[PDB]
């Protein structure tokens, strides 16, 4: 019913389950509530500016998760800020967000004026430190539950938002499996991430993850591709293509891999039909959304039959519980088959960018009660209700 509940209650029910591995360490279900239990009852100590975001800086480690985990805990929203981005993105944010502490996952590699800062040995030492914690003020409704930033915006997603999203994701459009193993590519600064995590979490699974050291070199990364027994795959199509180079990228070497989910950027047709010539039995699926709405909102199955019938690949159909539909230069319906604006509708529209009022009345207004926001997406849709993405307005 609540997110954090719901990965809690894991902690109760499958203590030893794994839930994190990287390269071969790994932690439980266990030690995630244990950990997000200390550093919320930590920060609950610290008085801070109460719904103030903290910044969360690091890499792909379990501590990175854990960290998000023990922020919405302790009621406040978590930025998170990727290790591998420029030194002035930490800066910017921080003069964007002005957030109530950074955690320190990574090491900062720079200074963040008067925001406190937790060290990654503090927060060592705070995860090392159990508590016995009643999780009584954890976000929800509402209230914001990440902040990810795009100038550089950020775009508030609230606890409800992004159950809109995982809800879907846990539906019959995908079927994933109970209990999962997903990889986790995206660093997660990025909306994409989500994609993997969140549903991953809410199913009970385990985050097989890769650092950037990895996939920053070829040799590591197809190396390190056959050792992980995943069944989901989320990433760039253009990441995909990378790993295609890789003849040995096929289900008779990688034979748990029963998903791939796509997003972010064009799924051209060469890429996935290589990758249906080298998994003829996964499930895959093109998806698109933007970040103020949550992850993705439209998908489609790409089957033998899509494959044969489209050229370029629709972005699909949109989710049970958001209206998407197209416009005109003035906010009115465009016939089915015209070109027009994306206008996205209902429960996972951000509330809008933070301490930014004025992109936020541009791009986000209210739709018959509910929140709407203008992609700046051009595209197309049929009677059947498929979309198409065709370029952007900008
Ligand atoms: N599956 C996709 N096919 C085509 N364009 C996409 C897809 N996924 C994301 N994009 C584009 O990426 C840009 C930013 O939106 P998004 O990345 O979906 O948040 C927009 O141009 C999107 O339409």
């Known amino acids: 019913k609540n997110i954090i509940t719901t990965i809690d209650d894991y902690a109760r029910t499958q203590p030893n389950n794994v839930v994190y591995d990287v390269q071969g360490v790994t932690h439980t279900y266990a030690e995630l509530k244990a950990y997000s239990d200390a550093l919320a009852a930590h920060l609950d100590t610290l008085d801070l500016p109460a719904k103030d975001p903290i910044i969360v800086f690091g890499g792909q480690t379990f501590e990175m998760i854990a960290t998000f985990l023990g922020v919405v805990k302790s009621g406040r929203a978590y930025i998170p800020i990727d290790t591998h981005s420029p030194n002035e993105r930490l800066t910017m944010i921080n003069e964007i967000a002005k957030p109530a502490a950074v955690i320190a996952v990574a090491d900062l590699p720079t200074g963040v004026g008067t925001t406190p800062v937790i060290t990654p040995d503090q927060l060592a030492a705070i995860f090392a430190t159990p508590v016995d914690y009643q999780?009584?003020?954890?976000?929800?409704?509402?209230?914001?539950?990440?902040?990810?930033?795009?100038?550089?915006?950020?775009?508030?997603?609230?606890?409800?938002?992004?159950?809109?999203?995982?809800?879907?994701?846990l539906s019959d459009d995908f079927g994933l499996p109970d209990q999962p193993n997903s990889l986790s590519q995206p660093p997660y600064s990025f909306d994409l991430s989500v994609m993997d995590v969140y549903p991953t979490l809410a199913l009970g699974g385990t985050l097989y993850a890769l650092p950037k050291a990895v996939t920053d070199d070829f040799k590591q990364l197809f190396a390190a591709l056959p050792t992980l027994p995943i069944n989901v795959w989320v990433s760039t199509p253009s990441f995909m293509d990378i790993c295609l180079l890789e003849p040995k990228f096929n289900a008779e070497n990688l034979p748990t891999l029963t998903h791939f989910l796509f997003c972010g950027e064009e799924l051209t047709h060469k890429t996935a039909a290589t990758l249906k010539k080298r998994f003829p039995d996964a499930r895959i699926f093109n998806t698109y959304g933007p970040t103020e709405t949550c992850v993705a909102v439209t998908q489609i199955e790409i089957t033998d039959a899509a494959l044969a019938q489209y050229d370029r690949l629709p972005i699909g159909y949109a989710k049970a519980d958001?209206?998407?539909?197209?416009?005109?230069?003035?906010?009115?319906?465009?016939?089915?088959?015209?070109?027009?604006?994306?206008?996205?509708?209902?429960?996972?529209?951000?509330?809008?960018?933070?301490?930014?009022?004025?992109?936020?009345?541009?791009?986000?207004?209210?739709?018959?009660?509910?929140?709407?926001?203008?992609?700046?997406?051009?595209?197309?849709?049929?009677?059947?209700?498929?979309?198409?993405?065709?370029?952007?307005?900008?």
Do not use: C
């Open 135 to 169: 999780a009584d003020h954890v976000v929800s409704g509402d209230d914001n539950y990440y902040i990810i930033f795009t100038m550089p915006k950020g775009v508030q997603i609230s606890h409800d938002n992004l159950v809109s999203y995982v809800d879907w994701m």
């Open 322 to 394: 958001t209206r998407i539909l197209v416009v005109d230069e003035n906010g009115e319906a465009v016939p089915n088959g015209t070109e027009g604006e994306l206008i996205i509708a209902g429960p996972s529209v951000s509330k809008g960018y933070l301490n930014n009022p004025e992109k936020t009345a541009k791009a986000f207004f209210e739709l018959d009660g509910q929140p709407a926001y203008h992609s700046g997406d051009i595209g197309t849709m049929d009677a059947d209700g498929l979309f198409r993405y065709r370029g952007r307005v900008d």
